[model samples]
Structure formats: structure tokens, C-alpha cells
Target chain A: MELYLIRHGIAEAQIKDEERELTQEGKQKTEKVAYRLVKLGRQFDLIVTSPLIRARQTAEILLASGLSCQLEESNHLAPNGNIFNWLDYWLKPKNFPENAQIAIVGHEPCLSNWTEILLWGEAKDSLVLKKAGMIGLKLPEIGSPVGRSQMFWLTPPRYLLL
Target chain B: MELYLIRHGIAEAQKDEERELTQEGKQKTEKVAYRLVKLGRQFDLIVTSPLIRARQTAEILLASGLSCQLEESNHLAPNGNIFNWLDYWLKPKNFPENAQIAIVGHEPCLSNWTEILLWGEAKDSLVLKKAGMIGLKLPEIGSPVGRSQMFWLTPPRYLLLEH
Candidate 1:
């Protein structure tokens, strides 16, 4: 199973950040990233997003760019959400196939912290998930993903822009 | 010293010396080489496995505006050990501080070498894709190579992302 954790694109600076929308620059860069994946013949089985307007908009861009037709909103992607809850409730129950490709669009610190926890059994703050960047993990077939995953790819938005 | 671990480009599906880079691999390697150049990547020396595909990749990198000397190393072959490489090829070079050197080889080995150098164990935690590169900063006289920070890691496909 392949899991891609992508941070939301650039968003307008505002007091109500949760309701902040993506900027024009964010939309273009996110489209570029999505289309690049599409050109590579990459498609995800499902994409989960934080309900925050910025993150939802990023997920929508991915869906519109032919990455996947399915998008679900979950508070588990919130900046302060608990990842263990997400795994035990939403993920572990679904016995996804071996080739399953899934994506999560969310905010930072939370996304990178979750990545570290999933890969190393604890969060060491070792990773920095840049805006519009992604952390790719190849999850194990069995056992908890914490400290049992392999990180095969990590990319910044600049790299995708070429 | 700055170190880069690279995997050879896609190769023909064969055993022994018969494995060579495919045409598509060569083209993509060239493109990535130029992209690195555009990113201001410069190497003092490039050590590669003596295998046909690895040598071909090293040569391509040299030809694609990367001003560097190329050398062959048996220690970079698949299953090559990090200890043997350090004692034989690396120590002898006496590369200066911040000197950049690129090593091109096969998968499992490059990935293992990377982990061993950075974290002192090979837990299969990292993956080095074909024609991809891993960049690191090594201490001037650092021994054991444990805990060296990784600055960059990118797959060839990401480098192939051209607008």
C-alpha cells in the first residue's frame, strides 16, 4: 500500500485561518503538481482531506486533475488532530489491496509529525513537509504502520515545478 | 565533504556484464544531469561501479556539463560493503572539506550505504530509485559516518518533472 501525505498549498493570510482559501499561486502550483502526477500515469484510489477550506481546495485540485475521483473530508487531518485515531478507526478496518494508492491532503507539522510517527514509531520532528510538498511511504501489508513503513519518496514543490 | 549516492539508470533485464542501460535510460539520465547542472550541482569526482551500466551513467554525467573526473570502483557494485569502500577508495582520495563527490551504483547497495552512513544501520528505511540521487554533508574527518545529515533526496521522475 502506498500512502502520500501532501500539505495544503499556499493560502491567504487571515485571522480565521481555518477558513482561509487558497491563493491563485496556490491553485496554479497545486495544478502543476497534480498534472505532473497524472502525466506519470499515477492515480490514487482515494484522497482524504482536512475540512479546512485551504486543504479541501487542494484536494479538489487533485481530483480535478484526474488523480482520483474520490475525496473524503476528515478532521483527522487537522493541524492538531490525532493520527492514531485516524489509523485505528478509518484505516486499519479497511483491508485495502496490495496495490492500493491513497493520498491525504492536510496541514503541516501535523502531516510531518504523523509521517515521523508512522515511520519511526515516534515523532522526532525530523521531517519538514513543505507547502504543497509530499511525503510518500510504502506501508507494510501487516502490523501497525508506526516504525514499520519505508519512505520511498519526499518532494518539495519546487522539484515538481521543474 | 559533500557526498551524493546515485543509482544507475534503467538497464536491460539481464545478468552479469550483459546488463546495460537502455536508450530511454540514457536519455533520461542526460536530462537529469543537465537539470542538476542547472541546480548548480558540481562534483569533484564521481566514483561508479565498474559495471557497464554504471560506467555509462558516469560518462553521461561527465558529458552533460558536469565538470568532474570519473573513476571506477569495485566497492560500489551491488552488495558492496561500506567499510570496504571507505578504506579503499574514499580514504585514499583525501577529498577536502565541503568537496563534492558522487557515487553511482545499484539499488540495495546505495540505499544501504546511505543508511549506514547516516544512521549506522540498514533497516531498508530508504529507497533509491533508478537514476535518482541522495545528497549529504560529511564531516571533514568524520569517522564512522553516523548521523550525517541528509540535505536532499529526489527520484529521477521528480527530476524529470519539466514544465
Candidate 2:
């Protein structure tokens, strides 16, 4: 299975916290990133985003810009959600098909921390994911535990413009 | 301090122990080296495996005009014990402080050493494609204690197309 982890784009300052929306710059950045993803010929079977407004909006924009994925909002992607639960429940082979490609859009420390846990088996901020940054991982098997995924590539938002 | 880890390009399929890089491998890897140069990447030290393919990779990158001390290490070979190599050759006493370093080696060793440096274990998942490179930054350059942060990971497919 292939997994893509993406940090939500820049957003408005905390007006209503979880209700805050993406800024104009955030939309443009995400649009650029989505364009780049399309250029890379990446298509996803599932695109999950945090229920937060910022992350949901980012996911919507990405799909709108030809990202070619089914977008869903889930509390599992929330900042305080249990990462392993989501993995076991939603990402396992029992839940999804073999060779499914999944993309997740979420917040800062959560995204980076989950990436750390996925790669290292425990959470440490080994990766500092900037806003709109993304990384791809190729996993051994869906039901397998963390630390079995190979990091295929990593890209910051700036590289999207290139 | 920054550390760049690179896997040598694809090699000939001959059963010989010291296989040289194939022509396509050299071209693809040279493209990546030039892309690094375009990114203004610089190095202070280069340590490579003694194998022919790895040596050829180091030579190609060195030809990019980046001045750096080049050293060959038996420990960098595919079968070398990377953990022991780090303890013996990469300790603060032997390497300079606050300097940029690059390592050119083979698959499992390069990936193993990278995971050990990042997670203090070899089984953790991380892989570099042939001719791929990854950059990591240590908080302080004395003895890396598995707290190093990943800077970037670039695959040959991406860099090969850029340049």
C-alpha cells in the first residue's frame, strides 16, 4: 500500500480555532501542490482530512485541482486523535483493498509526529513538516504495525512550484 | 551539522564482487550530482565504501568542483558493520565538529546506518532508491544519539529529470 502524508496549508489566525479557514495564500499553495501531484501522476483511493475547517478546506481544494481522490472528513485525523487506531481501523487490508493508495491531510505536530511513529515505531519529531509539506511511504502490508513503511519521497511546499 | 547519505548507482549484473556502475547509472547519478550543485550544496568531508561502484559515484560527485576531503572506509562496504564503524570512525574524536559530511555506500548498509542514526535501531523503515540521497541534521555533532532530524529525501527519478 502507498500512503501520502500532508500537513495542512497555512490558515487564518485563530479566530475560532478549529473553525478557522485557509487563507488566500494557503489556497494558492495547496493548489500549486495539487497541480504538482497531478503532474506526478499520483491518484489516491482515499483522501482523509481532519474535521478541522483548515484541513477540510485544504483537502477540498486539492481535490478540486485535479488531485483525483475521494475526500473524506474524519476525527481520526484530528490533532489529538489516536494514530494507531485510525491505521488499524481504516487503513488495514480488512477495511481497504490491496494496493490501495491513501492520502492524509492534517495539522502540524500531529502530522509530523505520526510520520515519526510510522517510520521509527515511536513518536519523536524526526520530521519537521512545514505547512503544505508532503511525504510518501510504501508500506509492507496494510495490517502490519508501524515502522514497516519505506519513505519513498519527501517534498516541501516550495518544491511544488518547481 | 548536516549529513548526506547516498546509495551508489545501479551496477553491472556480472557476478564479480567489485561491479562497476552501468552507463545509464552513471548518467542518472551525474544528473543528481549536478542538481545538488545547483542547490548550492557543499560538503566538507566525503566517506565512501571501497567498492568500485561506490568509488565511481564519489568520483563523479567530486568532479562537480565541490572541494572536500575524500576517504575510503572498509566499514562502508555492504557487509561492513555500520554501528561499529560509527563508534570507531565517526566519533567526535576522529571527525571534525560542525562540518558537513557525505557518505556513499550500498543499499542495506546505507539504509541501516540512516535508521540507526535516526531511531537507534536498524529495523525501522527507511529506504533510498538507487542513486538516491537523504539529508539529515544533528542537533550537535559530538555523538549522534538518534535525535537527528531529516532535512530532505531526493530520489534519482526526480533529480534525474530536473537536470
Candidate 3:
């Protein structure tokens, strides 16, 4: 199974936290990246995102890129939210597809940490998840979802320019 | 007061309803238009942004455009939302000293209506509120923030070129 982890795009100043929305630039940046994702030709089975306004806005733009992604807000992806809790609810053996690809959109550190935990069963002190970047991981099989995950390729939003 | 209206830059559909932002095109377009606004260019009062994402983005871009950035949501001002709110805001009574300047936004009709309402006629029949383009009604005053009765300008004239 292939998993695509993404970060939310730029948004309004979090000055008032609750009302943050994607900046016009943020929306457009996400759109440009979506074109690259489409070009990759991966038909995602599911697209999940953080509950924050910015993440939801990013997910909305993904749909504009020609993918019918239904944005799901999982608290686990929220700031300070737990990753395993999210996995327990959304990607556990019973909830996730047996062999389908999935996409999860979240903020920094947490997403990077999620990747770390999947690869090493523990969070690292220095793995950085750049903003608007994504890491794609493939599993040899669905047997051990976390411990056996394989890092396929990593692409930051900046890569699209190249 | 002087007012500069700007439309959002080019964007392709991500889905039928969702649209995303580009890294430079839209942001840069807004930046320049905003620079004019910040230099104390004119239309002081702000009546902008009806779209959720758009309203907020414009406000942020215009932050440096004026001495103060004030915004309000007019549901009737989105594209065709102009018909409902434009005429009302154009009235001199509705536009006072500080209100001598008001910048309204959206797609086509808003621009057209502002032109017709202020110029006594619109240059073109269509609404050309393309991204980064503005339709302004200036009420004559004396300074940069004059109280001119009416004024309007479209960017580069290439604004209404495509759609």
C-alpha cells in the first residue's frame, strides 16, 4: 500500500487561530502542486486532512486539480493532536482498505513525526517536514502497517519547479 | 478618495467547485495593486470581498495599501452580487467624507456597474473584474484621498482579454 503524507499550504495569519483561511497564494501554490500529483498518475483511494481551516482549504483545491477528494477532518492531524489515535480511528486494520493507497494531509512536525514513527517506531529529534511538502511511503505488504513501512520517495512543494 | 480594484489571477479547476492558488501570479498581481493603495492612492473606505477565501486574502494584501484596511462581506457582491449592493453604495449619501472612497470587488458585473454608475456609462457591457484589476468610484476631494464624485481604471486593458 502506498501512503502519501502532505502538509497544509500557506494560510492567513493565525493571529485569531480559529478563523485562518488559505491565502490566495497558498491556494494557487497548492493548485500548481496538484497538477504535479496528477501527472504522477496515482489514483488515490482516499484523501484525508487536518481539521484546521487551512488544511481543509488545501483539500478543496485538490478537488479543483481534477481529483474528487472528499476532505475528512481528523483531530489527530490538528495541532498537538495524536497520530496513533488518528491511525487507530482511520487507518487501523478494520478501517483502512486492505491494499489501497491513502493520502493524509496535516501540519508540520506531526506529519514528519508520523513518518518517523512509521519508519523507526519512534519520533526523531531532527526530521523536518517542510511546509507544503509531501512524503510518499510504500509498504511491502499490509501485514505490519507501521513497522514495515518503506520510504518510496519524498517530494517537497519546491520540487515541482524543477 | 481613490480606489483600485483587483481581480484574482489565472487558476484552473481542481474540481468543478474547488480552485487553488498559484505561487506568484495571483499574489504578485495583488501586491502591485496594493502598493498603489498603500501609497495613500485614494478610495479610502473599503467595501470588498464577498467570497470567503477572497475577502480575507484581499484584506491581507491590502494591509500595506492604506492607512487603515477595513472590509465587509456583501453576499450580494459576488460577481452578480453587485446589482444588489452597487447602486446603493454609489449614492453620495451612502458615501460620506471618510466613505468618499469605497472599493468593491468580484467578477464582471461589479466592474461594469461601477463604470456605468460613476462614468454615467460603462465602457464595455461586460463585467471585467479580472484578478488584480479594479473598478473604482472616486468622489472628488482635494488630496490623495480626495472626495471625487467618481473615478475608475482597469489594469493594462488585458484584463478582460480572455474570460
Candidate 4:
């Protein structure tokens, strides 16, 4: 099983205090990335999103692919929610389902931090998921021993668009 | 000062899912309601959208009103992030800002539930902003601070097409 983490698309800035929505370019960017992943034949069992408009919009766009998957909204995925709890939840024995791909679509800082914590011990802070980049993590086979978390591939949204 | 929690014009939902661009409906819905609100001209602050499409639409339509001096965004404003959660947290006290008048250009389960939250009670449990619904038109919208009633006004498309 693998985990695919996605970042939100380019959103309009909160200039003048209104909650900025995603830019047209940002919308297209996310759409392109999601379509590319679909074309790659990657199927997701669960697609989770943050409750924010930008995050939801991203999830909506990704889910718009018309794939047969269920969307789960988690408060833990909030812009300010902790990643450790979320990671620990997945790490739990019964929690880690077999042969399933879980896709988490979220925001910056948190996404950046969580990636580092999952891949490495601490967040590098330097590693970034540009707008709509995606990361796939190979998990230990459910029936097999649990301690074999390894890196798979880091596919930026641009790669797919390219 | 009165708050006009307005919804934007018809945003044609995308068929491709990916290609769902904010249509003329989206823009018009916001414009007409905003213009209608200007006709009343009873606002202190104008709170617009943060979303690019929504913001673009709001700016094009309402910015000219000049009645809008301050534009802000908050959960109480129209585009609150917790649309689905709105049903969970709708009350007169939820307006966590001092701005008495505001306009929200957003979508949702949040937008749909706005009336239910404000009127102390609501009738339409499944109301959506059909592009350009503006202001409050409730028979008894919570308190009589300003406009007690709520109005799920029309979008720009209908207004322009009709009047």
C-alpha cells in the first residue's frame, strides 16, 4: 500500500482581507495534476481534504476526475492541525488497511512539515510541494512486518503537466 | 449598518469536473445582488471573496458601488470555510466581528445553512445561493438588529434578463 500526499493549487492571495480563492492558473494546475495521476492508473481508496475552501476546492477538483472513491473530511487535516496524530493514526495496526492508497490533500507549512516528518525524522522545511505536487509512499505490506516504510517517488504536478 | 451576506451569480458547474470554470452566471449573480444592495445603500463595510473567481466577480460588480469602504473576509462573512460545518454552528452570536454590514461571496453547505443559523430558526433546510441571492429576508431572522428577514435573492443572469 502507498500514501499519496497532494498540495493545493495556486490560490488568489488574501489581498484586502477577503478569503482568497484559487487563481485560474492555480485551478488549472491542480486539474492537470489530478488528471495526470488518473491517467497513470493510480486509484485511491480514500481521498481526504481540509475543510478550508482552498483545500476543499483542491479535493473537489481532484475528485472531479469521477473516480470511484469516497471523500473523508478530517478536522485533523485543518491548516493548523497536527500531523503527528494523523501519522500515528495511520501507523496503528488495525488502522493501516491493506492494499489501499490514501490520498491527503492539504496546505503549505503543514504539508511541508508532514512530508519531512514522514520521510525523514524531522521536517527539512526546505523540501516543498509546489502548488499541486504529489508524493507517493510505499507502506509495509499489511500482512508483512510493520517496520518497512520506504520512499517511492516524488512527482511534482509539473511533471505530469509536462 | 446592515450586513448583506450575498451569494455570487450562477457558476456553471463543470462537466469535465476539471474544466468547471466560473461562468457568466457566477459573475452576474454577485453583480446584480451587489448592485441591488447598493440601491439600498445601507452598508458600512463591504466584505468580498478570497477565491480568485469569486473575488474577480465581486470586484467587477460591486467595487464600483463606492458605498464599500472596507472589504474583509471572516467566517461570519459570506465565504466562510466551514460551509458543511455551518449547520453545526449557526447562531446570531457566530458573527464574530464588529462590522455590522457585510457581504459574503462564497458557496457551500455553509451558504445554504446561513439562514438557518441566523433566523433563530429556518424553514428551508436545503437552501443554496442560486448565483445572486442578496441580503436578509426573514420573517423573523433571529433579532431585529437591522434586517430580520432573509432574501435568497436572484443571480445576475436572471436580474439582467428580467429587469
Better of 2 and 4 by TM-score: 2
lDDT of 3 at A83: 66
The alpha-carbon RMSD values of the candidates against the true structure, listed in the order shown, are 3.8, 2.8, 21.0, 20.2
* Tens-digit per-residue lDDT, B57-148, candidate 4: 45544555635564545553443443333333334335533335545565553344443434232223222444544444322333332224
Q: Give the TM-score of candidate 4.
A: 0.45
Candidate 4 residue A119 C-alpha distance from true site, Å: 2.2
User: What tens-digit string does per-residue lDDT give for candidate 4 at A5-88?
Assistant: 787788887553225678899898887777766666667887888887778788888888854367777767887788766655
Candidate 1: tens digits of C-alpha lDDT, residues B1-163: 8888889998888467658899999988998898888777789888889889899999989998686588888899876788978887788879888789999998788877876776666767787888898877776776746656565677887676442
lDDT of 2 by residue, A1-162 (tens): 778888899988855698888899999988888877777677887788999988989899888876755788778899889888887676662465557788899987887777777777678777757788888887776456576567878767764443
Residue runs of model 3 more than 4 Å from their true location after superposition: B1-163
Per residue, candidate 2 scores C-alpha lDDT tens digits across B17-45 of 58999999899888778877876777887
**Candidate 1 lDDT tens digits, A68-87:** 98999888888777999999
TM-score of chain B of 3: 0.57
DockQ per model, Cα: 0.29, 0.46, 0.01, 0.01
- Candidate number of the best lDDT: 1
iRMSD computed for candidate 1: 3.2
Q: How far is candidate 4 from the true structure (C-alpha RMSD, Å)?
A: 20.2
Candidate 3 C-alpha lDDT tens digits along B53-99: 45544554556554355666553255454434534544333545444
